[PDB]
Amino acid sequence: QSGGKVADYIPQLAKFSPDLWGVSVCTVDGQRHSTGDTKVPFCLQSCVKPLKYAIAVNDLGTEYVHRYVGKEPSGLRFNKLFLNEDDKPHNPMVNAGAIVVTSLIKQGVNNAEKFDYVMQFLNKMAGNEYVGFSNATFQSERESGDRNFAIGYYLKEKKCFPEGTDMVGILDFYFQLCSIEVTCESASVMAATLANGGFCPITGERVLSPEAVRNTLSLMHSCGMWDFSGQFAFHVGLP
């Protein structure tokens, strides 16, 4: 297959060649295998949202997490800015829900220790694999991502944020979470910890509560593919 249309916005993402292709496999027990360009690092744009939702749930309880976000598919593009009948984001998967669930994690703590905590937790989840940070793609999407700023200002205007929260710092933190880079082999440990009962497939450590894993699996099955989620559940039927 050929496809095309790599990336127009975020010009740092457009520098990748279109013929890059790699697939990594890791099972629950530890059986792993990879082919292609699996050693090349790449960013984790929008793929960290189920992970950060799991972190927020495991830290704060699902009722307190869903006090501010819904659990329904939006039915439109993730860039489209609108709320439900209750003036809330539709799901954590879309940009508004991602911003709100970034607001929940460690509300009384500054950005540096928040990033340190989430990076330590994700490294524990990854079995101390390679988890980097592409600062080149963080300088981009910050000076060029304008739709996310509009969504954040709309959410601040609708007063859907938790009290005593700065919108600009939370949006920058969300950009930092989106700017995390992993390889395909390192991301094979991802989607395997939550494929298990919250335990790491390699180290066997206790990482996530089973409730958080079940909730994020249900959310990925429901609206984990934007408008293509219905067709994906119809044909593939996998989270």
Next chain:
Amino acid sequence: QSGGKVADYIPQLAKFSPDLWGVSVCTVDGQRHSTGDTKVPFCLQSCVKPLKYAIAVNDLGTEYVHRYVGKEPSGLRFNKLFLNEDDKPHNPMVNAGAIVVTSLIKQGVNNAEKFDYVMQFLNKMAGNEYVGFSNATFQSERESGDRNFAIGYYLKEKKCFPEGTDMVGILDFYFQLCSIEVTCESASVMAATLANGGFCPITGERVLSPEAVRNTLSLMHSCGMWDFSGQFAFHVGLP
């Protein structure tokens, strides 16, 4: 629980008592059990749509069925009048998709044989149980149902109908299909034929193809509960 708000439109449907409540259960093997007032007949409004979708798929092939209807959730009420980017209904569960899939079932033959055909399939699925027809709720919702007429005329204006199809007759046939009434015990035989691989749990015969059963099960799991489908999959996770 109490609830409230029985039915505003379809004034024939508003005559039911608010404390009326019963549950019937039937399994794949054949054993069944029911409690309460299960013998009382009631209309199958908006519940026959997975059944008619299964009939249409089993008779026409899923590619020809989905040539006109998409397979994505809408995210809004079933009475809402809008289409997707491709000027098509989002899914067969909403009213527009139901109208389009009723337009496909035996398009070359008039209503008199079409109703007999779908009633024969419904009786074969039900194992010759009670499948009645509440004419009182068919005379109502035809003189008072106005949103369906607007939706059908919008679909005709968008030219999403098959060639050589009358809008008014197909809409009347859709009303007739929605006006079919069954009891709780009789409807318990339904949703068990498609719980099996298309085989009737009572007669042991074959009714539906496994592909049609899988397709309608996936669609009902995805967007079979309107805007509450996401919450239903989150909490219950059953079609």
Next chain:
Amino acid sequence: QFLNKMAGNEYVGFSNATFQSERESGDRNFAIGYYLKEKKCFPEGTDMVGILDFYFQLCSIEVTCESASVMAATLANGGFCPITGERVLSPEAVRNTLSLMHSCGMWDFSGQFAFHVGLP
């Protein structure tokens, strides 16, 4: 300076108290500005944040009713100040802004205002 020329050197102040507010609390305007920046409907080489702050400053100007009586009177004339008689606005600009105020100068109430009052 030009608005003072239009006002005939009347009282035109600047309420800084209402400028500090609506800057830390006006969030819908920021969303609109970022949406316009995302849609690329700005002139080339223009900073969105500074332009939005300038727009807030223009909205933060304060005048009295007597000073605002000279307002809507230079443009009620042929662009000349009713008091000083100086050349202020070109007649084309006055005609265009009068037509725009007559058309959509009252938000959703503009149609009813033109139906009943029928004045810009």
Next chain:
Amino acid sequence: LEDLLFYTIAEGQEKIPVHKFITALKSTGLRTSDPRLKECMDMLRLTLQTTSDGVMLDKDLFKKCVQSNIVLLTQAFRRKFVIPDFMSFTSHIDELYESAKKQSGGKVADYIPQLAKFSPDLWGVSVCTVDGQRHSTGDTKVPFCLQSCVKPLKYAIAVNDLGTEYVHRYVGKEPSGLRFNKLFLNEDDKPHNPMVNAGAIVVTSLIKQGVNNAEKFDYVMQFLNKMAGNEYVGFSNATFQSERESGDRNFAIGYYLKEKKCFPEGTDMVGILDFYFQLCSIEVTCESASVMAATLANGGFCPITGERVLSPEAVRNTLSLMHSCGMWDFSGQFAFHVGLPAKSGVAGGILLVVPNVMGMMCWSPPLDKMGNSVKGIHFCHDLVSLC
């Protein structure tokens, strides 16, 4: 010519096992992950699955297979490298490591609270030579930030890209004699040298002035990766979120420089300051940083790749600047006792350079009151006293 050295490795037998071939290769100090011998390494890999003998290499296969690395292997296996008897050198390094482990020091980090989380007993030393010999001990695999140790590197980048006259049009080349946090300029209202914070800010203001930060960081990271031989050059975002909400002396210095109008025309101070924080937030390991200070120990040529990175003029200029004022107020004492071009930082790293011989890296989170690691200074003193 490879046959005689292969027979010298051999004891008379024509067939030599691969286990014997990898034996004593570590004695030569050349690691197996060198891209120069990546042809030979890929040869060994492909012959390991397909040999039909089991762990064998044979003379004639070695003769026919090696087609581009004859010179390097001949220089390596006849002890033609600049540092012979590498076992004695590693024993000396281990003895100095054991001697330096006795000291305690203290005062790890007060400001940048993310930097204060490091263990005070962490200690590691990495060594790399010009030819390609390398050896590391201790905690050499732990990543750490390159705070103030990237300033000679960015100065070399700026000089190599802009010319020394254009670089020094804005920055002087004299030591200051005070701390790097001190806010003052020279008689001509210019930063004293690129090593202190003001000079670092001004030289970050010069690199690709017409391009935004997104491509500037990619450019400097490409140069750093070419210098490091595609080793681990990461980015610690945790220490970049800190030192931005808590680093106030740098903001005051930047505003003072903006007031003095020493910046190039059409430059935004805040963006350049953020880019400077990003440049100082780059993290590396001791092994990865050992590849650095060896490219500039050579004539701008990377010891691992063998390619060309920097002009010799830039290398000479940054070596002279590191020799002159590479240790803040301790530069005079360091030249008096050690007399080698080295650069320190608030992280704890020491970029000790021996010109045309070998490069080093010493990591110690505890710091002196002046701004240098106590263990690294003691290690350098013991090294210059012994060898």
